[PDB]
Amino acid sequence: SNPFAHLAEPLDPVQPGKKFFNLNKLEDSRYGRLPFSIRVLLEAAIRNCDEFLVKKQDIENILHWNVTQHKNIEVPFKPARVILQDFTGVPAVVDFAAMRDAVKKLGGDPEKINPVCPADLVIDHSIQVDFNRRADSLQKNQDLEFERNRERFEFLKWGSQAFHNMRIIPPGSGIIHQVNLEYLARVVFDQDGYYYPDSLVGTDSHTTMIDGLGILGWGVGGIEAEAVMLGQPISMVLPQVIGYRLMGKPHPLVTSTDIVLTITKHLRQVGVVGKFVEFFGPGVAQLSIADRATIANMCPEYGATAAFFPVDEVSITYLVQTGRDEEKLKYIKKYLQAVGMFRDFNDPSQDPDFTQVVELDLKTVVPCCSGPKRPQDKVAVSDMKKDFESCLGAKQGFKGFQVAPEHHNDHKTFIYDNTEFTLAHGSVVIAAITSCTNTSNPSVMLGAGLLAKKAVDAGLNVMPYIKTSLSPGSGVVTYYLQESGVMPYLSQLGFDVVGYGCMTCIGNSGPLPEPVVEAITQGDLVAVGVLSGNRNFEGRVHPNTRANYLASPPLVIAYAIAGTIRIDFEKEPLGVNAKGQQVFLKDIWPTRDEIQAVERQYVIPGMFKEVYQKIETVNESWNALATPSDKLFFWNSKSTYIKSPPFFENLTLDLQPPKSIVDAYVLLNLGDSVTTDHISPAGNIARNSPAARYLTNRGLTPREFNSYGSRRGNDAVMARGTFANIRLLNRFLNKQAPQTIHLPSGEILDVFDAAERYQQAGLPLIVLAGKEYGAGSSRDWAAKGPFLLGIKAVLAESYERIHRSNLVGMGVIPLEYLPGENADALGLTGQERYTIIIPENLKPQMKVQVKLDTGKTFQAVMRFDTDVELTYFLNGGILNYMIRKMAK
């Protein structure tokens, strides 16, 4: 039985069937001092207590958080729901389909593979910026999206009918996290007579954005999301919780982008890897939900697991503003107050006992950008001309392009649209208002529109060759932009709506005009992309921009007008208004009270109702797609998009006792913070690449290749794209090249091809890496890929959260150097042969010895963090375990 059933009571005498687990009735004083994020974990456990998967001791361990956060103990977490996007959605539905096949083959019931909790899939990663600057670019971009992606869309639509509790938001709707904030989020579930907190895991590293609204949720890899969808609790070490105290008032010209950029730099310097961040202080109450979500969004960019903003009165008002039903609205607040998860940020006696406390004074926040190559390299707007000019002559790296001093004023004239332009170092060639990070915030969006209005009024313009775009996260933004009369002014400056999806933010930035590309490559120019996203690593925005800066939407427009980032806005005018002479950025920048006025009068409940009323049925191309009535998928042999994966090939019911890895070669010797885009690229498939050869052999031409993202349903392509990033720094070669050495023969080969040589001779493989291995995106192909390449272990100094879990879920051992030890300190060259002794009895985070062919040995920490993770390893992976659990 549930040993906590005596806690269940009516929330309201008048609607008596609707109960909740009243946590205050624990009569435990520890509860009221808990961080609010831990309180949600506590509720999830209490409601789910059965004594098999969620035990009574687990509840006691969570209540005792204050002590047990230091005892490295594991706790179950069952989230209320799952959210997916299309890039991770396809491979997730392919593995569900493959699990059905596998269950059936063991004589089980294929119907047991079905989501038991609600799952939402938003299709937002497919559309690209092919056309811009016109009223018709939206239709033309959506048309192209459908033509390119028809087969994957047919497969996803199939999935939504073949699996229970799968809702699809079709293409053209918006971006996963924005749609989540505005529409999908419940905040409080009302389910089978029970109220409980909304909480979630998403297959996207930025799922943390929902934490701004007070829903506990974070990114997991696809295989973890599948386990969760099948009823399996996440197993996690009980986290420490950093309290982040916000104080004072931000300056009236400060955007929420300035704040998040400041917080990123700061939290990256405190180091919060493996930890929860909870916000509190007087400052939080002044921040709108949109502002909170922006801070919570960039959570993976500063390394925290979650960035939680407890539900308060600002949250309630956001729910009424976005047109949540008044029926729901009554019990949402009333429940949170009764259970003790309703916050008052202006009450210091309500503050939890945090692990420790880091502060930020909001008046110290200045207008700023991040770049040119990392999200944490925050640079003030006042200092942008000086910083970029320093970057020009500086040693190549995160803050250098080392262009020779005599070449600092290189430029190239070009002809676009029959007129002559000049391009120089620092010239803006992409100016994109993208990203759910900022388009969910009417303050920066209307701020940008009012800046545009005042700029057109002052006679300013954006030169026609600049790739300017607006990619809103929902139809709601287009609606209020038009309603406020601000849209025609954004149109004029080249910021017509180009589509609803990730687009520039994820790297789907489209082509640049050919004369512009020839100017950049001819004069070796450092061309600049300015964007309102959260990621600016030197691969990911556009192949032709060497510098990319994160900036608030109004700054995006300002730099587009300027045409360059080599400007000192306070000293040099943007243009001359014939009449009233010189016009500075100061003169056209709107304050937070002109914006707030426009926001109160145009961002209204009726607008959200109309946009989301028809959300699922409005797409006529989607509605028209034919899908089979099948419950088991008919794998088409002709398909280059959907392929039955090899993972569960020859799966047995009985467990295999895991063997030592004997004499492995090092396939790759990698450095610090190798990202999941290096391990598993999502964009362009290069002409000289193994994936390109596989595709050419199936009759495809380069323009049909599509992205690596779109092919995540085809393991053959995805394996060939593993470590296929053109900027991969393999320390075997000491240059940027997606290649390695096949050590027995000495030949340099593309990484897939070297792996195949090793595999065919039956040789096991490992990877060596430095700090923060696997940073960024959540893609589980960063673990499946290496698994199919024959990689049995990784040895790194540290791992990022999601990636480590994905390695474990694929049966790869994540090994870690003992603190103070690494490849240089142990004298590893990467040329030795590695034996990893896996003992008969395993323990979380145990030390194992590593023997070398040279006779040398050392120790590494085996990074299975909990007992259930050890079980996943014993089973050869998380899904193999789930198949077995379902089969019997």
Ligand code: SF4
């Ligand atoms: S790629 Fe950008 S726009 Fe898309 S979900 Fe991620 S953060 Fe949001």
Ligand SMILES: [Zn+2]
């Ligand atoms: Zn010249």
